[PDB]
């Protein structure tokens, strides 16, 4: 990525769109984890409407 191809005229290695691709280690990093809200993992299913009358 710093030295061009010598047997080709003008070719370089292509650039990376995403350097660190291990998004598991990206996501469970303390930099990201502190700037998150609490997870809402409680399932609230529908309530059978009883007649109050």
């Amino acid at each position: 990525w710093r030295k061009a191809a010598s047997l080709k005229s003008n070719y370089n290695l292509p650039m990376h769109k995403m350097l660190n691709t291990d998004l598991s280690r990206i996501l469970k990093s303390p930099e990201i984890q502190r700037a998150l809200r609490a997870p809402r993992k409680k399932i609230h299913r529908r309530v059978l409407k009883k007649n109050p009358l």
């Binding site: 309530v47 409407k49 009883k50 007649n51 109050p52 009358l53």
Partner: protein, 148 residues
């Protein structure tokens, strides 16, 4: 259905047959109920009629979703800024037309009522012609118990 009448029936939120809604009355409301007069049957509800309607068919419009009013938190989360925090506050603001009647009435979903038990008299004619359409003043409660 005529287009002018379709627009008023949508502004009254009556998009389906046997739907019911609470409307406060003034000149601007009577002149719209006159336009939709042969297609509706309106009247003056009792306090027990409001109690039956809000307790049995009361659904709230919360995040554009028809949510059953099974707990007072559901009312208090949306109408709590107008000091309406329970079923009793909702019934009070509906029955006595208060300051936040527009918000309290628009929070309620339009009432999805059944077919009238016993039967209709005549759908196509006015109430004073021995039918059903138009203004039945004290007799909307008799339809409310058989339709609710």
């Amino acid at each position: 259905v005529s287009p002018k009448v379709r627009k008023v029936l949508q502004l009254l939120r009556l998009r389906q047959i046997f739907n019911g809604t609470f409307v406060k009355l003034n000149k601007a409301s009577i002149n719209m109920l006159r336009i939709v007069e042969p297609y509706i049957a309106w009247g003056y509800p009792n306090l027990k009629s409001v109690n039956e309607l809000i307790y049995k068919r009361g659904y709230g419009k919360i995040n554009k979703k028809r949510i059953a009013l099974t707990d007072n938190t559901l009312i208090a989360r949306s109408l709590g800024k107008y000091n309406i925090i329970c079923m009793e506050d909702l019934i009070h603001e509906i029955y006595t037309v208060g300051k936040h009647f527009k918000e309290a009435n628009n929070f309620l979903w339009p009432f999805k009522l059944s077919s009238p038990r016993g039967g209709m008299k005549k759908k196509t004619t006015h109430f004073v012609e021995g039918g059903d359409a138009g203004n039945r003043e004290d007799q909307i409660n008799r339809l409310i118990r058989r339709m609710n």
